[PDB]
Design a binder for these strands. Structure first.
Ligand SMILES: [Ca+2]
Length: 312
DNA sequence: AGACCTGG
DNA sequence: CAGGTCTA
């Protein structure tokens, strides 16, 4: 009872709730959908992972988001810890309002949205997001999830152990910039991605002014943030957009890839106007990005996440 | 337009 | 072959 991952039923006194309807958030649609790769459904409807440097288990009912944190001396989450959860799901951004706006300017969105409510954007830490997505090229969610997990066990601080699962905080820049990190990462199967992780860690710390340079990009504009991220090795337009959208508060960022094309072509009969090439390319991808921004508005990135989930 | 790294 | 990135 006092051991293993908790459940709302097994340790009722250790859970605290945050008012939140399923219409504003659906854990099963957000946590394993390629935004964050650190969440696991260790027990049906119960999701565990690291948030604000601690381990949490989350589960929801129709009107509540039940949270539980593991630190010593067991205890229900404090009002301040709960705010960290609220900020992580950016609960201040009302989904009902967004769905309504996107649904009123886009018939197709309104159709698919009906069955997929609760899809919103997580507000992730810049470092975790940068290196997690550096590992995203040529990999599916499952592979990415594995690489990120071994990377954290290897270079991340040990937090606590639940059952046979030991949680680790995400690796720091210092750790990732360490010597022989690349060789070590290759043994963990990160392949050529190992080099970018090592190279980007050292580049930020030794050429850009460190952690401050990254975090500070949140106060910077989307165009400026995107441009800056792109100098880092292993980070291109795609990864830069994912980072801007997921960690730098740039909701208008749309990460274009082949999947997005499939949707643009099938559900909007979209095709390139500016660039010559009629297939995916830097110039055409830039258009697709502008197309959806023009269609959905300031939160075009959030809107696509919805379609991205409806397409499973 | 290839090369870079591996399981499904 | 997979959500891409880098380079000729
Ligand atoms: Ca780059």
């Amino acid at each position: 009872s006092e051991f293993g991952h908790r459940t709302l039923a097994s340790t009722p006194a250790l859970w605290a709730s945050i008012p939140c309807p399923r219409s504003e958030l659906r854990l099963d649609l957000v946590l394993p959908s390629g935004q964050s790769f650190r969440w696991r459904e260790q027990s049906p409807a119960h999701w565990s992972g690291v948030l604000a440097d601690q381990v949490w288990t989350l589960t929801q009912t129709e009107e509540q988001l039940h949270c539980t944190v593991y630190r010593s001396q067991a205890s229900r989450p404090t009002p301040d810890e709960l705010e960290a959860v609220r900020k992580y799901f950016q609960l201040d951004v009302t989904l009902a309002q967004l769905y309504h706006h996107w649904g009123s300017v886009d018939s197709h969105f309104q159709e698919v949205a009906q069955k997929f409510q609760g899809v919103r954007l997580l507000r992730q830490d810049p470092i975790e997001c940068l290196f997690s997505f550096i590992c995203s090229s040529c990999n599916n969610i499952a592979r990415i999830t594995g690489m990120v997990e071994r990377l954290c066990q290897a270079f991340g601080p040990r937090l606590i152990q639940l059952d046979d699962v030991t949680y680790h905080g995400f690796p720091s820049l210092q750790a990732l910039a360490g010597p022989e990190v690349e060789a070590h990462l290759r043994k963990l199967g990160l392949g050529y991605r190992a080099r970018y992780v090592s190279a980007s860690a050292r580049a930020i710390l030794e050429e850009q002014g460190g952690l401050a340079w990254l975090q500070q990009l949140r106060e910077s504009s989307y165009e400026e943030a995107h441009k800056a991220l792109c100098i880092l090795p292993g980070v291109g337009t795609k990864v830069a957009d994912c980072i801007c959208l997921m960690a730098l508060d740039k909701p208008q960022a749309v990460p274009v890839d082949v999947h997005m094309w499939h949707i643009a072509q099938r559900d909007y009969s979209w095709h390139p106007t500016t660039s010559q090439a009629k297939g995916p390319s830097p110039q055409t991808n830039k258009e697709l990005g502008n197309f959806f921004r023009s269609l959905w508005g300031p939160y075009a990135g959030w809107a696509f996440a919805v379609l991205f989930s409806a397409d499973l």
